[PDB]
Protein backbone atom coordinates (compact mmCIF):
# COMPACT_ATOMS: atom_id res chain seq x y z
CA UNK A 1 0.00 0.00 0.00
CA UNK A 2 1.40 3.35 -1.15
CA UNK A 3 -0.54 4.90 1.75
CA UNK A 4 0.99 2.57 4.35
CA UNK A 5 3.37 5.21 5.67
CA UNK A 6 0.75 7.97 6.13
CA UNK A 7 -1.15 8.46 9.38
CA UNK A 8 -4.81 7.49 9.40
CA UNK A 9 -5.86 10.99 10.49
CA UNK A 10 -3.76 12.56 7.71
CA UNK A 11 -5.41 10.29 5.10
CA UNK A 12 -8.84 11.42 6.31
CA UNK A 13 -7.77 15.08 6.29
CA UNK A 14 -6.44 14.77 2.74
CA UNK A 15 -9.57 12.95 1.56
CA UNK A 16 -11.57 16.00 2.66
CA UNK A 17 -9.15 18.31 0.83
CA UNK A 18 -9.41 16.15 -2.29
CA UNK A 19 -13.20 16.37 -2.15
CA UNK A 20 -13.01 20.20 -1.99
CA UNK A 21 -10.68 20.15 -5.01
CA UNK A 22 -12.91 17.65 -6.89
CA UNK A 23 -9.97 15.22 -7.06
CA UNK A 24 -12.03 12.07 -6.62
CA UNK A 25 -9.37 9.53 -7.70
CA UNK A 26 -7.07 10.97 -5.01
CA UNK A 27 -9.93 10.99 -2.51
CA UNK A 28 -10.58 7.29 -3.19
CA UNK A 29 -6.92 6.37 -2.81
CA UNK A 30 -6.73 8.22 0.52
CA UNK A 31 -9.85 6.50 1.82
CA UNK A 32 -8.63 3.07 0.65
CA UNK A 33 -5.48 3.78 2.68
CA UNK A 34 -7.59 4.72 5.66
CA UNK A 35 -9.65 1.52 5.47
CA UNK A 36 -6.51 -0.56 5.23
CA UNK A 37 -5.36 0.77 8.64
CA UNK A 38 -7.78 -1.85 9.95
CA UNK A 39 -9.94 0.24 12.27
CA UNK A 40 -13.70 0.60 11.85
CA UNK A 41 -14.96 3.77 10.11
CA UNK A 42 -17.10 6.46 11.68
CA UNK A 43 -20.27 7.69 9.97
CA UNK A 44 -18.43 10.64 8.47
CA UNK A 45 -15.58 8.41 7.27
CA UNK A 46 -18.01 5.91 5.67
CA UNK A 47 -19.54 8.76 3.72
CA UNK A 48 -16.13 9.95 2.50
CA UNK A 49 -15.38 6.43 1.23
CA UNK A 50 -18.72 6.19 -0.59
CA UNK A 51 -18.53 9.68 -2.10
CA UNK A 52 -15.07 9.10 -3.48
CA UNK A 53 -15.77 5.78 -5.21
CA UNK A 54 -19.24 6.84 -6.38
CA UNK A 55 -17.66 9.74 -8.26
CA UNK A 56 -14.86 7.61 -9.73
CA UNK A 57 -17.12 4.80 -10.95
CA UNK A 58 -19.77 7.30 -12.01
CA UNK A 59 -17.39 8.85 -14.51
CA UNK A 60 -16.35 5.40 -15.73
CA UNK A 61 -19.99 4.37 -16.20
CA UNK A 62 -20.77 7.53 -18.18
CA UNK A 63 -17.76 6.91 -20.44
CA UNK A 64 -18.63 3.23 -20.89
CA UNK A 65 -22.15 4.19 -21.98
CA UNK A 66 -20.84 6.61 -24.60
CA UNK A 67 -18.47 3.99 -26.01
CA UNK A 68 -21.06 1.20 -25.90
CA UNK A 69 -23.50 3.32 -27.92
CA UNK A 70 -20.82 4.03 -30.56
CA UNK A 71 -20.00 0.33 -30.70
CA UNK A 72 -23.68 -0.61 -31.10
CA UNK A 73 -24.05 1.85 -34.00
CA UNK A 74 -20.97 0.35 -35.68
CA UNK A 75 -22.69 -3.06 -35.74
CA UNK A 76 -25.81 -1.81 -37.57
CA UNK A 77 -26.57 -2.61 -41.21
CA UNK A 78 -25.03 -0.01 -43.54
CA UNK A 79 -22.27 0.89 -41.05
CA UNK A 80 -18.78 1.10 -42.55
CA UNK A 81 -16.13 -1.20 -41.03
CA UNK A 82 -13.70 0.83 -38.89
CA UNK A 83 -11.59 -1.95 -37.38
CA UNK A 84 -11.15 -3.17 -33.78
CA UNK A 85 -10.51 0.20 -32.11
CA UNK A 86 -13.99 0.98 -30.76
CA UNK A 87 -14.27 -2.46 -29.15
CA UNK A 88 -10.70 -2.26 -27.81
CA UNK A 89 -11.25 1.14 -26.17
CA UNK A 90 -14.64 0.14 -24.76
CA UNK A 91 -12.91 -2.94 -23.31
CA UNK A 92 -10.16 -0.77 -21.78
CA UNK A 93 -12.68 1.43 -20.01
CA UNK A 94 -14.72 -1.59 -18.98
CA UNK A 95 -11.68 -3.33 -17.47
CA UNK A 96 -10.80 -0.20 -15.48
CA UNK A 97 -14.39 0.05 -14.22
CA UNK A 98 -14.41 -3.60 -13.18
CA UNK A 99 -11.11 -3.00 -11.37
CA UNK A 100 -12.61 -0.15 -9.34
CA UNK A 101 -15.63 -2.29 -8.46
CA UNK A 102 -13.38 -5.18 -7.42
CA UNK A 103 -11.34 -2.80 -5.25
CA UNK A 104 -14.44 -1.58 -3.42
CA UNK A 105 -15.85 -5.08 -3.01
CA UNK A 106 -12.46 -6.17 -1.68
CA UNK A 107 -12.48 -3.46 1.00
CA UNK A 108 -15.97 -4.46 2.02
CA UNK A 109 -14.92 -8.13 2.24
CA UNK A 110 -11.59 -7.36 4.01
CA UNK A 111 -12.91 -6.49 6.55
CA UNK A 112 -15.53 -3.75 6.72
CA UNK A 113 -18.69 -5.87 6.63
CA UNK A 114 -17.59 -8.56 9.06
CA UNK A 115 -16.70 -6.01 11.78
CA UNK A 116 -19.89 -3.90 11.24
CA UNK A 117 -22.37 -4.78 13.99
CA UNK A 118 -24.51 -1.69 14.28
CA UNK A 119 -27.45 -1.58 11.91
CA UNK A 120 -26.47 1.81 10.46
CA UNK A 121 -22.99 0.62 9.47
CA UNK A 122 -23.92 -2.89 8.34
CA UNK A 123 -26.78 -1.63 6.15
CA UNK A 124 -24.54 1.08 4.69
CA UNK A 125 -21.87 -1.45 3.67
CA UNK A 126 -24.32 -4.02 2.34
CA UNK A 127 -25.96 -1.29 0.21
CA UNK A 128 -22.49 -0.53 -1.19
CA UNK A 129 -21.95 -4.26 -1.91
CA UNK A 130 -25.26 -4.34 -3.85
CA UNK A 131 -24.39 -1.16 -5.70
CA UNK A 132 -20.96 -2.31 -6.89
CA UNK A 133 -22.25 -5.73 -7.98
CA UNK A 134 -24.96 -3.79 -9.84
CA UNK A 135 -22.29 -1.77 -11.65
CA UNK A 136 -20.54 -5.03 -12.57
CA UNK A 137 -23.89 -6.35 -13.84
CA UNK A 138 -24.34 -3.32 -16.09
CA UNK A 139 -21.33 -4.41 -18.17
CA UNK A 140 -21.60 -8.19 -17.78
CA UNK A 141 -22.37 -10.26 -20.87
CA UNK A 142 -20.84 -13.64 -20.08
CA UNK A 143 -21.18 -16.94 -18.22
CA UNK A 144 -21.08 -15.09 -14.89
CA UNK A 145 -23.80 -12.47 -15.51
CA UNK A 146 -26.46 -14.43 -13.63
CA UNK A 147 -24.12 -14.96 -10.67
CA UNK A 148 -23.21 -11.25 -10.53
CA UNK A 149 -26.90 -10.31 -10.58
CA UNK A 150 -27.59 -12.77 -7.77
CA UNK A 151 -24.71 -11.34 -5.71
CA UNK A 152 -26.21 -7.86 -6.03
CA UNK A 153 -29.66 -9.16 -5.12
CA UNK A 154 -28.38 -11.05 -2.09
CA UNK A 155 -26.53 -8.06 -0.66
CA UNK A 156 -29.47 -5.70 -1.16
CA UNK A 157 -31.83 -8.27 0.37
CA UNK A 158 -29.74 -8.69 3.54
CA UNK A 159 -29.56 -4.88 3.87
CA UNK A 160 -33.36 -4.60 3.40
CA UNK A 161 -34.03 -7.23 6.05
CA UNK A 162 -31.84 -5.47 8.64
CA UNK A 163 -33.19 -2.02 7.75
CA UNK A 164 -36.83 -3.07 8.17
CA UNK A 165 -36.11 -4.61 11.59
CA UNK A 166 -33.78 -1.99 13.00
CA UNK A 167 -34.40 1.42 11.39
CA UNK A 168 -37.44 3.75 11.10
CA UNK A 169 -39.09 4.02 7.67
CA UNK A 170 -37.78 7.59 7.33
CA UNK A 171 -34.14 6.71 7.98
CA UNK A 172 -32.10 8.13 5.03
CA UNK A 173 -29.95 5.01 4.67
CA UNK A 174 -33.07 2.84 4.58
CA UNK A 175 -34.66 5.14 2.00
CA UNK A 176 -31.57 5.28 -0.21
CA UNK A 177 -31.16 1.50 -0.05
CA UNK A 178 -34.78 1.05 -1.18
CA UNK A 179 -34.34 3.61 -3.97
CA UNK A 180 -31.33 1.73 -5.33
CA UNK A 181 -32.75 -1.77 -4.90
CA UNK A 182 -35.87 -0.59 -6.79
CA UNK A 183 -33.60 0.60 -9.63
CA UNK A 184 -31.86 -2.81 -9.53
CA UNK A 185 -35.25 -4.46 -10.08
CA UNK A 186 -36.15 -2.16 -12.97
CA UNK A 187 -32.83 -1.89 -14.81
CA UNK A 188 -30.98 -5.14 -14.00
CA UNK A 189 -33.44 -7.86 -12.92
CA UNK A 190 -36.13 -7.21 -15.57
CA UNK A 191 -38.70 -6.76 -12.78
CA UNK A 192 -40.38 -3.37 -13.32
CA UNK A 193 -43.47 -4.29 -11.27
CA UNK A 194 -41.29 -5.14 -8.27
CA UNK A 195 -39.40 -1.87 -8.78
CA UNK A 196 -42.62 0.16 -8.79
CA UNK A 197 -44.13 -1.69 -5.80
CA UNK A 198 -40.97 -1.17 -3.74
CA UNK A 199 -40.71 2.51 -4.55
CA UNK A 200 -44.37 3.16 -3.73
CA UNK A 201 -44.45 1.17 -0.47
CA UNK A 202 -41.23 2.83 0.67
CA UNK A 203 -42.58 6.31 -0.11
CA UNK A 204 -45.89 5.70 1.64
CA UNK A 205 -44.40 4.22 4.81
CA UNK A 206 -41.98 7.13 5.05
CA UNK A 207 -44.77 9.70 4.58
CA UNK A 208 -46.63 8.19 7.56
CA UNK A 209 -43.58 8.63 9.84
CA UNK A 210 -42.58 12.22 8.89
CA UNK A 211 -44.56 13.61 11.84
CA UNK A 212 -41.99 12.17 14.28
CA UNK A 213 -39.08 14.14 12.81
CA UNK A 214 -37.24 17.37 13.51
CA UNK A 215 -37.05 20.06 10.81
CA UNK A 216 -33.56 18.94 9.76
CA UNK A 217 -34.44 15.20 9.67
CA UNK A 218 -37.61 16.01 7.73
CA UNK A 219 -35.54 17.81 5.09
CA UNK A 220 -33.20 14.82 4.70
CA UNK A 221 -35.98 12.24 4.41
CA UNK A 222 -38.20 14.28 2.07
CA UNK A 223 -35.31 14.87 -0.33
CA UNK A 224 -34.87 11.13 -0.86
CA UNK A 225 -38.64 10.58 -0.97
CA UNK A 226 -38.67 13.00 -3.91
CA UNK A 227 -36.22 10.74 -5.76
CA UNK A 228 -38.56 7.79 -5.22
CA UNK A 229 -41.41 9.92 -6.64
CA UNK A 230 -39.24 10.97 -9.57
CA UNK A 231 -38.54 7.34 -10.48
CA UNK A 232 -42.20 6.43 -10.10
CA UNK A 233 -43.07 9.29 -12.49
CA UNK A 234 -40.49 8.02 -14.99
CA UNK A 235 -41.85 4.46 -14.80
CA UNK A 236 -45.62 5.10 -14.82
Amino acid sequence: GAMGSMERASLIQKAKLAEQAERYEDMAAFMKGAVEKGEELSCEERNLLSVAYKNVVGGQRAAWRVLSSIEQKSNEEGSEEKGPEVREYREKVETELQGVCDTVLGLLDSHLIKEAGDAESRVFYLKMKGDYYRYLAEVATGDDKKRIIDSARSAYQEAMDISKKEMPPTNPIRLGLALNFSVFHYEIANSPEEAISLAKTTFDEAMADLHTLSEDSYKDSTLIMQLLRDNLTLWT
Binding site: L179, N180, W235
Partner: peptide, 5 residues
Protein backbone atom coordinates in the same frame (compact mmCIF):
# COMPACT_ATOMS: atom_id res chain seq x y z
CA UNK B 1 -31.54 7.08 -16.32
CA UNK B 2 -33.31 6.67 -12.94
CA UNK B 3 -32.14 8.26 -9.69
CA UNK B 4 -29.81 6.44 -7.28
CA UNK B 5 -27.86 7.65 -4.27
Amino acid sequence: FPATV
